[PDB]
Design a protein around this ligand. Structure first.
Ligand SMILES: CCO/N=C/c1ccc(OCC[C@@H](C)CCN2CCN(c3ccnc(C(N)=O)c3)C2=O)cc1
Lengths: 58, 245, 297, 58, 58, 50
């Protein structure tokens, strides 16, 4: 389909698989999102990463 | 060559010279839980020989008027030998079973016993007789232990279902003129890979006389029915202190 | 590492369940082959030993002289989906104006299809079942009249707040799935997935849900398996003011993508309660008809 | 169709032929099931199978 | 379409051209039938056929 | 012609009388062969079933 690229997720790090019948992409369905995760951004945002075996403070 | 048999497992051996082959429930042998069906992460314990052995738990007397009995698994073994201890110390349990029901007589006695295994054998009450009272069976009736329990209304298996169709379950018959035992091998049957040996009884063993015991005055009148069983592929997980219920 | 022999040669850990039988395609009834007279010793198809626990292996061919019959009768209509994928009644919900039940314009129904005999008896032929389902909701007044009324059905899974009134905050339905429809519109219809924590639903559970002493006052929990409790189905008329019409909602279920395990005897005594197999002890009836003598029709 | 594999029969020993218009497979029709049968599992679950001609107990 | 062959005319000496949207063929339209005819089966079922020119009884 | 299977495979009409025995020449009384003691299990010529 040759429509407009006016979706809120146009240019996202996760590609979607949607359905639409109109010339404006935001009219499309939610579809399926990409199953990528990055827990470290929140759970482990340390500069110098420390291993599991070693002692965190040495 | 199909009439004679020897069942050896653990430090126990059984013999019979009047068998009728062996039944393997739903056509499949017991097995350990695969890594893809499993869900609990702790490494299981598989005691082997100390728990996968033959245990002779009870003897009932077959009388001309007997109505029939039933036992629940693994309830019957929860307080016996090493198997019992493992079932008590662990939250999770799973296993198969080899059931061997024994009953011999003479070439002049007659009668036939239906020996069957019924998974998820839920017991019902007579609802106060009129059916207007929603009563429920007591713990000693749902989980009778090693002594088992006698059926009150065998025709409907004490659960509103026809015993005449019980043969749709893994079974064998002990027809005195033919054989003196029944051997049924049962795999683990459940909708979960493991479960509690205490709160859940996977199946029930039913031993019901369909053709009444009979003989003439003078012949041995005491005709016992003995229940021997052995766990197969026992696995346990979720360790902590022992609990009886 | 392993070094003692008994350990190296043990079968401990075998996860491959050996199977003695396997499925073969059977799209039509078996055919009949030609057969002739047989007058042999040693060969005896007619004699069996039912004690073994197996059904007779004797066939027409070996009991009488047969002809050849090419049987093209299909076996399609006896598949699990063919048998179950037919919508049946499993629930009724009344929303009367003046009543003793749900006179407040809303109702909560615990999802439990064991309240109706036809559907119940069919599913109880098996112990374990896994399936998706199509649910259809038929609404109208008690006379079957269609009135211009708007309703709201909401699926409240275990742990979600159950609406306690027609204006309850839970009707905001920001996460639970809700259907808004008119009695004038065709019956609402949706697809439901297999939602149990278990690999299958089970119509029978010979156990207790919790640990501890199972004294008289708790025996009502024997046979209760939470793995089968999918939640509540709530309905309400949409408005802060009472509806002008009395309503009834009939719930139909159509299973699909069905799998079943462990067949069992079929109920032969009338049902009394949803939660159990209790039967009227003073009315135990034969499974079927009877006659005066075994030598007379 | 590139949908989700959330049907109750996903990974069954019998393949189905269904129709669907949504991203969730369980929304699909019942279709046609595979006509395979295994009567022996119930009718003849014996360890040592015995022929028809011979005598079951010998 | 991969449907069931449950039509009343499945295996007929005349092929049809039909439309259907369901898995059961009998749900299909009537379509067009084959224009074959065999009048003789009724109009001239004689063992020894006689020509037009000759006299039927000779 | 024949087309249904039971007809094609029938033995109806077999005029050949099958014989279980056949004649052998015997111009003289049978001879006697040497024999020795036999002390076996399983073998039992003396026992019959008239
Ligand atoms: C707008 C929102 O629209 N939402 C619709 C909607 C409809 C239906 C939904 O759920 C369907 C779940 C059904 C199929 C499970 C029925 N089962 C399985 C096991 N079991 C059971 C077993 C043993 N015993 C009992 C007993 N009662 O004693 C009971 C059952 O009753 C959910 C949502």
């Amino acid at each position: 389909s040759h429509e407009n690229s006016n979706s809120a997720t146009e240019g996202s790090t996760i590609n979607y698989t949607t359905i639409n019948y109109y010339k404006d992409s935001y009219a499309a369905t939610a579809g399926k999102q990409s199953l990528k995760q990055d827990p470290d951004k929140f759970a482990n945002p340390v500069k110098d990463i420390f291993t599991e075996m070693a002692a965190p403070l040495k | 060559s199909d009439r004679v048999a020897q069942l050896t497992i653990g430090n126990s051996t059984i013999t019979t010279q009047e068998a009728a082959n062996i039944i393997v429930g739903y056509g499949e042998w017991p097995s350990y839980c695969s890594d893809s069906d499993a869900t609990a992460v702790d490494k299981p314990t598989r005691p082997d020989v100390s728990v996968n052995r033959f245990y002779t738990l009870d003897t009932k007397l077959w009388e001309k008027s007997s109505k029939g009995w039933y036992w629940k698994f693994p309830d019957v073994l929860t307080e016996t030998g090493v198997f019992g201890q493992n079932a008590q110390f662990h939250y999770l349990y799973r296993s198969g079973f080899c059931i061997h029901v024994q009953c011999n007589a003479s070439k002049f006695h007659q009668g036939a016993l239906l020996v069957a295994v019924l998974p998820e054998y839920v017991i019902g009450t007579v609802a106060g007789g009129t059916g207007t009272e929603d009563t429920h069976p007591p713990y000693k009736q749902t989980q009778p232990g090693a002594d088992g329990f006698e059926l009150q209304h065998p025709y409907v298996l004490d659960a509103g279902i026809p015993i005449s169709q019980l043969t749709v379950c893994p079974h064998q018959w002990i027809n005195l003129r033919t054989n003196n035992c029944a051997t049924i091998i049962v795999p683990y049957i459940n909708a979960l890979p493991f479960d509690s040996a205490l709160n859940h009884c996977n199946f029930g063993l039913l031993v019901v006389p369909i053709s009444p015991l009979d003989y003439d005055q003078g012949a041995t009148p005491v005709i016992p029915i003995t229940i021997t069983l052995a766990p197969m592929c026992s696995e346990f997980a979720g360790l902590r202190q022992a609990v009886t219920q | 590492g392993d070094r003692v022999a008994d350990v190296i040669e043990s079968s401990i850990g075998d996860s491959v369940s050996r199977a003695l039988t396997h499925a073969l395609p059977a799209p039509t009834g078996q055919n009949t082959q030609v057969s002739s007279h047989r007058l042999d010793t040693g060969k005896v198809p007619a004699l069996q030993a039912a004690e073994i626990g197996a059904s007779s292996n004797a066939s027409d061919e070996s009991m009488i002289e047969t002809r050849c019959v090419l049987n093209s009768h299909s076996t399609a209509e006896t598949t699990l989906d063919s048998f179950f994928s037919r919508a049946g009644l499993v629930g009724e919900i009344d929303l009367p104006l003046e009543g003793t039940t749900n006179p407040n314009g809303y109702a909560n129904w615990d999802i439990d299809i064991t309240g109706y005999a036809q559907m119940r008896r069919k599913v109880e032929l098996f112990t374990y079942m896994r399936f998706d389902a199509e649910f259809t909701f038929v609404a109208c007044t008690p006379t079957g009249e269609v009135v211009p009324q708007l309703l709201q059905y909401m699926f409240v899974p275990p742990g979600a707040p159950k609406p306690d009134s027609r204006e309850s905050l839970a009707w905001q339905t920001a996460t639970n799935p809700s259907v808004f429809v008119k009695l004038s519109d065709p019956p609402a219809q949706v697809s439901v997935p297999f939602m149990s924590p278990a690999s299958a639903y089970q119509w029978f559970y010979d156990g207790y849900p919790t640990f501890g002493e199972h004294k008289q006052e708790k025996d009502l929990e024997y046979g209760a398996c939470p793995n089968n409790m999918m939640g509540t189905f709530s309905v309400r008329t949409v408005g802060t003011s009472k509806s002008k019409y009395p309503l009834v909602v009939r719930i139909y279920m159509r299973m699909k993508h069905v799998r079943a395990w462990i067949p069992r005897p079929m109920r032969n005594q009338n049902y009394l309660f949803k939660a159990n197999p209790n039967y009227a002890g003073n009315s135990i009836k034969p499974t079927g008809a009877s006659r005066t003598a075994i030598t007379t029709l």
